[PDB]
Amino acid sequence: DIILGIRVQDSVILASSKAVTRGISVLKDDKTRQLSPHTLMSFAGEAGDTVQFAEYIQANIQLYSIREDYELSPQAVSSFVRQELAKSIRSRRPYQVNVLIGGYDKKKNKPELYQIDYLGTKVELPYGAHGYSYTFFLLDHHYRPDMTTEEGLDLLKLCVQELEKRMPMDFKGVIVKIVDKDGIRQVDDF
Amino acid sequence: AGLSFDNYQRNNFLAENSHTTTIVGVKFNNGVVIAADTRSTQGPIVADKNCAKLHRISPKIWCAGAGTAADTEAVTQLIGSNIELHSLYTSREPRVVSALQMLKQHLFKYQGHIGAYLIVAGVDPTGSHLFSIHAHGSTDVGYYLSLGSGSLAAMAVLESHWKQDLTKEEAIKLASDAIQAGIWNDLGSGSNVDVCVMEIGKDAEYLRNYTP
Amino acid sequence: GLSFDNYQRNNFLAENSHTQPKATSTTTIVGVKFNNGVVIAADTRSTQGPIVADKNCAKLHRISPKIWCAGAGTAADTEAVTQLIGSNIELHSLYTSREPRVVSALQMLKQHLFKYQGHIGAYLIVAGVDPTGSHLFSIHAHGSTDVGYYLSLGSGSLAAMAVLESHWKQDLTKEEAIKLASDAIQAGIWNDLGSGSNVDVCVMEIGKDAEYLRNYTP
Amino acid sequence: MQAIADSFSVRLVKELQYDNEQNLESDFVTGASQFQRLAPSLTVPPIASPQQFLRAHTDDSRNPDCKIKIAHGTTTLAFRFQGGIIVAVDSRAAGNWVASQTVKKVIEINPFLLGTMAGGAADCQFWETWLGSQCRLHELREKERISVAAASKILSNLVYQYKGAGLSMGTMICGYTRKEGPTIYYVDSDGTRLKGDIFCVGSGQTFAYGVLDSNYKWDLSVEDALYLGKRSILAAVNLYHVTEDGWIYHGN
Amino acid sequence: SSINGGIVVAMTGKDCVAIACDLRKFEKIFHYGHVFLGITGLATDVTTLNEMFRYKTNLYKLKEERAIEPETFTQLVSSSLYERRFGPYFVGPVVAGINSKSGKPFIAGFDLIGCIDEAKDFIVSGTASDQLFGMCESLYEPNLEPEDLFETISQALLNAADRLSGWGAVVYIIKKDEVVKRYLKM
Amino acid sequence: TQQPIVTGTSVISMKYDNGVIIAADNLGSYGSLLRFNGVERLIPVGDNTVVGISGDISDMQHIERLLKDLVTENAYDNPLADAEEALEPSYIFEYLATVMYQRRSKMNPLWNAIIVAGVQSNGDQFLRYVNLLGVTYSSPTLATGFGAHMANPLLRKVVDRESDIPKTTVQVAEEAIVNAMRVLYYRDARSSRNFSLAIIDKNTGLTFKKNLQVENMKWDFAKD
Amino acid sequence: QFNPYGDNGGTILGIAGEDFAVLAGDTRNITDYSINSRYEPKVFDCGDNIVMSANGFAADGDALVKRFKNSVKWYHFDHNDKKLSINSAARNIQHLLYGKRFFPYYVHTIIAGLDEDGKGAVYSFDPVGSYEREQCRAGGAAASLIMPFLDNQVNFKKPLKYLSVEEVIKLVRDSFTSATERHIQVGDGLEILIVTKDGVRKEFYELKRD
Amino acid sequence: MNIVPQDTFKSQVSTDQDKSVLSSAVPSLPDTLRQQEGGAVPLSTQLNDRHPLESTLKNWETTQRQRQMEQYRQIFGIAEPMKRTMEMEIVNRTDFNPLSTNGSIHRDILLNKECSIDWEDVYPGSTMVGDDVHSKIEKQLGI
Amino acid sequence: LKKGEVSLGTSIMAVTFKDGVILGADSRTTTGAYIANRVTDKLTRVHDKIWCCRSGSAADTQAIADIVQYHLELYTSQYGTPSTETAASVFKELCYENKDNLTAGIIVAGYDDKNKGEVYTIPLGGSVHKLPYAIAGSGSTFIYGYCDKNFRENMSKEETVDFIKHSLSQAIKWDGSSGGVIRMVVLTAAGVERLIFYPDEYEQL
Amino acid sequence: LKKGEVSLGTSIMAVTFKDGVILGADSRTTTGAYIANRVTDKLTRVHDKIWCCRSGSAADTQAIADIVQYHLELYTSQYGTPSTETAASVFKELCYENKDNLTAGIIVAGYDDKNKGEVYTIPLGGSVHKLPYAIAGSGSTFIYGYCDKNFRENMSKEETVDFIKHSLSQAIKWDGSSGGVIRMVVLTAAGVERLIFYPDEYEQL
């Protein structure tokens, strides 16, 4: 259920769990939606509402990209996501949801990472994590603004090793995606 | 449209998760006087030592409120706008009975969820009027009325020294004495006294800091 | 006396995982007074909740050879209280070398029930004869007593009371009183699900031995 | 204007509540339109808290035959391979329900799709019949066989529109199409749609899943797959084989 | 570990009684001479009652210089249960026996505070509404031989068990002279 | 309503060989206070039908208004609505039961118990009962409230089976009902001495008696 | 808060014969240990060789029967008086029951009739709409006594297939008699509807009037 | 003759209860993209945990007008409510301004609110879908 | 009733006499134990000769009285002076149709040429009863026996005035929610008369 | 009041007249809406010319009355006939010292050659008050005003009998828990006199 995000000087690395639902065992990613060719969204929280919200956001962003024949900036995407999340709970009990948005602004050629909680509080962060009750110790002590992609991957591997030290066999693994100037890639070895 | 109910469920969810004055009115033989204290407290702390608690609905119709301050101010302003529009439409001096009816119906519409307890005094061509209005939509008529946390001392003073035929000066003195007793004997009342006197055929006289 | 041990343990078991076994809660009881004695009758069918447990239950208790009672509520409490008062009455009669009186048993029962502040669930109808005459009383579980000519108790007490109000008069014979009590118990049996089967009768007359009848209806 | 005049002219009908069109339709007063609505209408109490009312008046066991039936759900396992999809359920039950035929624990949505039953039995039966009708209408409209993903998403949206209302159902849609291949989706009443390859649901799901994972291969044989499914079931027995031509029952 | 709960069946024959209990050691039936008692409920309370009754029956035999009769034992159990009026054990006991002087079989049952429930046909304790009391009533026939009574009680136990897994039963057949103890490891 | 405020006590009815007899006392109690002493709880609807309502007074008046509207509408635009169009007790009871069930399904029930008695067109006796939940049932004898626990045992001793109806005369049934009313007055705090009676017969047609008081009361034994 | 639910405590039994069907019901209405009524119909004839019964809340069952009859009438009107089949009736009853999913009926329903093959068919419906086809189905408090009695004598694999209409009626009457002798809420009467290719036959057997 | 609004709850619910936002692919399900409600708002959530005053406020003026019409019908006849409703319908139907939501002057004159202000008037009340003139035209003309 | 809402703990008495009707009440409004107003006019005029007294919630009763007065003005604009039965029917309909949300009880005293003065009572729940006389309020419970013992039909004006004065004096004496002055309205054929009595007058009776 | 007990809802009166005292009561004992005992003698005697009537909880009042009779027997053995004041003091002490466990209220009537008849009332709580007349019970609230309007000092025996009969008849009429017959005990210099009045006599008043 843990979602992680590290913003290195030229890339965004998003990590998520593989799959877990109720007490049902499955083999089988269903927690990351590609909003834009250079913008990715990772969502965690209650099952049933988070997926619907992510699909709604992805549909809206794809419609905007089709209409304008242009790619919306990660900041505008984050603002739209925050507004939609705040609107969704304006007339009902709030549901647990945490969203990490990682993008690469082409106009400024800069990676960006944003975190939105269940009430709709968008915060721009160099690194972010949810679902862990800590893990910020490694993310704070060994973080630099000028870290390369390899260094960020090594830090993420250290965090994953820490996770795979106090968890049962249910921890299948970690799915890792990288957003940079060349687009969105998936990391298999790490 | 109107007052919103959005984020009501969100507010309840946050609450479940640990996320958180003396007024008198005296009617004398040719008019009405309304007096109030001038201290605003945010609990134990005195926020303001000189606050105007006498609000105006019409040039010759004034009121003073208690309960929820925002609700009292909003309802008074809305009724003032309605009264001004009605007077412009009819080209006549507004009546205290019309303001009473509008306030009563508006307060009964919300079934007591708008907390505003008012003393409304005024003078219109039919005479002088003084009413007390409850937050649920019930109104009462009297010759002398008191309101607020210091209303008991004020009522004692009014009962001590009230007569049928009172002059303007006697009524002003009686209202000032009632507010002074409320100020001295009640912790929530203090500072100065604000007075508003309304006679028949004369402009309303508004005296801030009548007794400092 | 009665132990209070394992009270906290029982509360913990009830509040965590266990259910305390229930106690038998006893069913029409009637008492009719005629010109020279009293008659006390009771239904003989006992049901464990919605299931009938026995078609012949002896709910008539003996305090003295001429003082009898019938109880409703907790059966164990009724039996224990009646037996204790009977032992006290026997000892008192031996001490005074005189026939026991109904008023003495009434006083003992009332004081004992008031001692426990209603925690003993026994509601009794006590009839008897003594050198002073024939007596019939009703005793509440909290220690209050009442005097009457005809009394009814139990789940089907309303039908029995209706029958008694229908066919009771001051001058009655033994046979008429027995018939009236049997009719009241029968009405409680037919018009209520808490009573059934036969009727137990006990007749106490002045100057004669008490007559106990089991299964009077057959 | 004449309708306006009629609407302001007049008691006995009002108390019978026949002045409402919904009451007339539900009682077949003027026609059979109640059986003409493709999307069924569900009745709720006209009170401030329908959900807690239903929960309190449902969690009250007084009559064994007045309770809502629950699907067996002992152990159901589904997997896919090059030859299609193998689904295995338990033929375990008696309870005063003597019948000519055995109880069917797998819903036959259509000659090409299978739906596992779990949780509430009535919810699964009703909503999968509705899903089959929707899929048939879609096939008639598009002149093509509807994909398993489309049907699973339709069911997920349907169960999500009533989330928290009281539905308790979890199903596994299994199908085989030329467009996609073999597909298995899991949809529960919460609103979770999960595509998978190996699924095990029930009390003995852990042992069956372990047995399956011990000897699972994409390239196997139909006999090998059926034997593996039966062994996984028996570790804690009806069998279904779904291929492009449809589903065939291999119960034993 | 579990142990709590169980079933006890008592039936009266011609000149004999039959008392049977279920079993997975820990047996719910204990004898104090020629009187048998089976207790259903918490294992701790069952053991406590067994120890207390062994104590009291040993003292009774030492004083009276004779064995204790089923009626006297029934009265003793009732009084002992009523002593803990406000702290009662979570138990249901059943007493069976043969009066050594008159020969008439005796069976009785109690609630948790000692209300005596004496039945002339049969008594079921632990569960008396699911599948035991009705089947015992259907299978009961008065005035049966000891072998017929044993067969009836074994059939009743098997019927209750069916309505398979690890199941056993202990059955005692009591005559005026000798007692036969049998198991049902089926 | 959510809860009743002013309530009635009980209505009791039974069948005899030629018709039915119904009775109910006249009292409206405001809690523990016997407030009103002029409330009539027996409504003669039509020619040979009587409806007895026990419970909330406001809902009883609402039901009376409904019955009056039904009577007026049945005879509306029908000059011959007196011989073949006369309302039968079965139709009135069916309408009342449907109304009660529909309002129960609306979560806004009528806090009443209704007993409908009369003689059908073919001379058959009709006697049925319905409650606030909408559940209806029929029996040779019927009662509500405390009368369901005390008056019913007294009446069933006269008519216990269906075959007992032809054996029961009008005098016996009337005496039994009067005795039941007296017993109810004996052992009911909310009861009233005054009561009203209605006899529906297939020969005479109807007889409604008001201002009836419980007589022959025995209190002399209280002297001791 | 107002409680709109209740129970009346009946007993129903439906048996699918080789060329017929039997639906029998008991009469009893008592609550809070007080006797209310003993005579009320429990088995209704819906026509088209379909017989329906509902046990539970009396008002709920009556409303369900009324709705089904109105639906059958409209189906006849709108389809040139076409006869309705047993399975179509079962589907209609399932939809009617599930239309109240969040305000459920507190009743259990059993229907019986003849299919297109002429063989007796019986369907049992769960309170919210789960329906199934069974040869024999007993509902109520006395089902736990009626069902073992039937299973002891006849076999559903004297075989039930060769049983006659009179034999099945006798068996049902004896089962109800045994339940009355053992249970305490069965008696007064027994209303039986028999569905054959010639129509529907009614038989009211008078048990003890206790 | 009501004062406080009554019968504000819904007896039944359905997935296609709002015909204006039906999905074209599956006409029996709502279209979440065109709803623009955030995408995580099931209809069931609209049945529980509501403020006990929202229904009273949203149906207050309608209830008052219905009571007034009932009084007119009782005292004056059918013609007076018929004429009032006819005038109101004619005024409402002939006004179509997709670029504004403010009511017409004639509507306020008919409702006797020429010189009356409530919080509805003070507070009358981005999206990529369904906020153009064409959507309002389709809603108005039933297209 | 709602939390913090004013309740009408009054003493109301309407009596019909040979020449019409008299409706009387006290003048105290309380807030539990503190007297908010020593002098109040509880006699509400709905029509020129149709008056009423209110109990229960003050706001709900005031709204109902205003609506009924508006309805009677509309009726008078068409068919002239209404009757007490019509006003009672309107009150009953308003109270019964709104009993699920409003707490209100009314006592209506009227006069007309046809009926020559009548009294109606509408308690909580919305049922209308026509009585020769009616008493209501917190203090009314203390004068049930007194009023029952001392009521006659077709009394004179002074006899009815004395009866109401004595009964209301006793109700004020034994009740803590009843106030100083007694206000009575006499509705007869001659017109409407208003009478007021002070504590120093009736306390010496 | 402990749950499941019996409440003594009744109509109790005690009136002092020229030649002594009279204590009157009804004879109804109800458990909810059901009359458990319609013939009840509520005139408890604690001494030859000292009587009392009880209210509250039946068991507690009976225990207190028994203890008071024991105390008065001891006093009579020691010093002779006690005065009504002594019995009232014992009642007050017993009720006050156990007011946290027992709910009891007593009305004590007595006579002696010195004081010539006295009435005392101990309401719930344990306070004592000496009055020319006393009323108590659930049905008393309806006759308060009546009792305040028809009591005179030094009435004759017949006048007091009529006054008590009328007041208790009204209380029975207006109270649901009051009914049956009226029982009165007259305590004078001559002795103790018992009077019983049946419904057919006082209902015609």
Between strands C199-205 and C37-43, the pairing is antiparallel
CATH architecture of the domain formed by G1-210? 4-Layer Sandwich (3.60)
Report chain D residues whose CB lies below 8 A from the CB of F69: 11-12
Q: Which two tokens stand for residue B109?
A: 């519409």
The Cα A79–Cα A85 span in angstroms is: 10
Distance from CA of H59 to the nearest CA of D (A): 16
**Closest among F69, A175, E8 to D15, alpha carbons compared:** F69
Provide the H-helix boundaries in C53-101: 75-96
Pick the CATH number of J7-205 from 3.30.70.141, 3.60.20.10, 3.90.226.10, 3.55.30.10: 3.60.20.10
Identify whether the C-beta of residue D31 lies closer than 8 Å to the C-beta of residue D143: no
Identify whether the C-beta of residue F195 lies closer than 8 Å to the C-beta of residue J12: no
The Cα J205–Cα J203 span in angstroms is: 6
Report chain D residues whose CB lies below 8 A from the CB of F103: 15, 17
Backbone angles phi, psi at H117, to 5 degrees: -125, 130
Backbone angles phi, psi at I91, to 5 degrees: -60, -45
Which among I100, I124, I141 has CB closest to F5? I124
Give the H/E segment covering residue B202: none
Query: Maximum Cα–Cα distance for chain C, whole Å?
Result: 60
Q: Which residues of A touch D (CB under 8 A)?
A: 19, 21-28, 30, 47-49, 51-52
> Residue D121 annotated as binding?
yes
Q: Which two tokens stand for residue A56?
A: 């709604």
Sequence-distant (≥ 6) Cβ neighbours of residue C182 within 8 angstroms:
C41, C199, C201, C216, C217
Contact D12 F69 (CB under 8 A): yes
Task: Write out the DSSP string of G20-87.
Answer: -EEEEEE--EEETTEEEESB---EEEEETTEEEEEEE-HHHHHHHHHHHHHHHHHHHHHTTTPPPPHH
I122 has a chain H CB within 8 A of its CB: no
Identify whether the C-beta of residue F217 lies closer than 8 Å to the C-beta of residue F182: yes
The Cα F24–Cα F200 span in angstroms is: 15
Residue from F1, F99, F137 whose CB has the most chain G CBs within 10 Å, to mutate = F137
Report chain G residues whose CB lies below 8 A from the CB of F134: 59
**Closest among J169, J26, J184 to J109, alpha carbons compared:** J184
Distance from CA of F104 to the nearest CA of G (A): 6
Give the H/E segment covering residue I116: none
Sequence-distant (≥ 6) Cβ neighbours of residue E30 within 8 angstroms:
E36, E37, E38, E50, E53, E54
Any domain includes D235: yes
Do I and D have ≥3 inter-chain CB pairs under 8 A? no
The Cα G25–Cα C51 span in angstroms is: 22
**Method for structure elucidation:** cryo-EM
């008490």: which residue's tokens? C210
H41 has a chain D CB within 8 A of its CB: no
Is residue E180 classed as helix, strand or coil in its secondary structure? strand
Helix, strand, coil % in chain C, rounded to nearest 5:
35, 30, 35
State the fold for domain E1-186: Glutamine Phosphoribosylpyrophosphate, subunit 1, domain 1 (3.60.20)
The Cα A32–Cα A173 span in angstroms is: 15
End-to-end CA distance of chain I: 37
Sign of CA dihedral E156, E159, E163, E168: positive
Q: How many C-beta atoms surround the C-beta of residue I170 within 10 A?
A: 25
Q: How many domains are there within chain D?
A: 1
Task: Write out the DSSP string of D164-205.
Answer: TTT--BEEEEEEEETTTEEEEEEEETT--EEEESEEEEETTH
| J205: closest chain I residue by CA | I149
Domain assignments of chain I as residue spans, ordered by start: 7-205
Identify whether the C-beta of residue H14 lies closer than 8 Å to the C-beta of residue H21: no
Residue from B9, B13, B91, B114 whose CB has the most chain H CBs within 10 Å, to mutate = B9
Identify whether the C-beta of residue A52 lies closer than 8 Å to the C-beta of residue H2: no
Measured between alpha carbons, how far is residue H5 from residues B137, G81, I102 in Å? 17, 46, 12
- Please give the positions of F annotated as active site: 1
D10 has a chain F CB within 8 A of its CB: no
Identify whether the C-beta of residue I95 lies closer than 8 Å to the C-beta of residue I106: yes
The Cα E89–Cα C5 span in angstroms is: 10
Backbone angles phi, psi at H80, to 5 degrees: -65, -55
Is residue E142 classed as helix, strand or coil in its secondary structure? coil
- Please give the positions of D annotated as active site: 74
List the Cα angle F180/F185/F191 in 5-degree steps. 120
Q: Which domains does chain F have, with CATH numbers?
A: 1-224 (3.60.20.10)
Report chain E residues whose CB lies below 8 A from the CB of G182: 134, 137
Chain centre to alpha carbon of residue A141: 21
**Closest among F36, A76, B109 to H57, alpha carbons compared:** B109
Q: Estimate the crossing angle of helix I58-79 against helix I84-97, to 10 degrees.
A: 140
The Cα D132–Cα D128 span in angstroms is: 6
Any domain includes D31: no
Domain assignments of chain G as residue spans, ordered by start: 1-210
Provide the H-helix boundaries in H37-132: 54-58, 60-75, 79-93, 105-110, 119-122
Distance from CA of F66 to the nearest CA of D (A): 7
Any domain includes D41: no
Identify whether the C-beta of residue D99 lies closer than 8 Å to the C-beta of residue G132: yes
Identify whether the C-beta of residue I118 lies closer than 8 Å to the C-beta of residue I16: yes
Backbone angles phi, psi at J130, to 5 degrees: -105, 125
**Closest among J163, I129, A186, I125 to F36, alpha carbons compared:** I129
Task: Write out the DSSP string of C162-207.
Answer: HHHHHS--SS--HHHHHHHHHHHHHHHHHHBTT--S-EEEEEEETT
**Closest among A150, A147, A157 to A190, alpha carbons compared:** A157
Identify whether the C-beta of residue F127 lies closer than 8 Å to the C-beta of residue F138: yes
**Closest among E156, C163, J26 to F157, alpha carbons compared:** C163
Measured between alpha carbons, how far is residue G143 from residues G113, G151, J200 in Å? 21, 12, 58
Distance from CA of D126 to the nearest CA of H (A): 15
Identify whether the C-beta of residue D194 lies closer than 8 Å to the C-beta of residue A26: yes
Q: Quote the domain boundaries for residue D231.
A: 74-252
The Cα D182–Cα D203 span in angstroms is: 26
Contact H47 D44 (CB under 8 A): yes
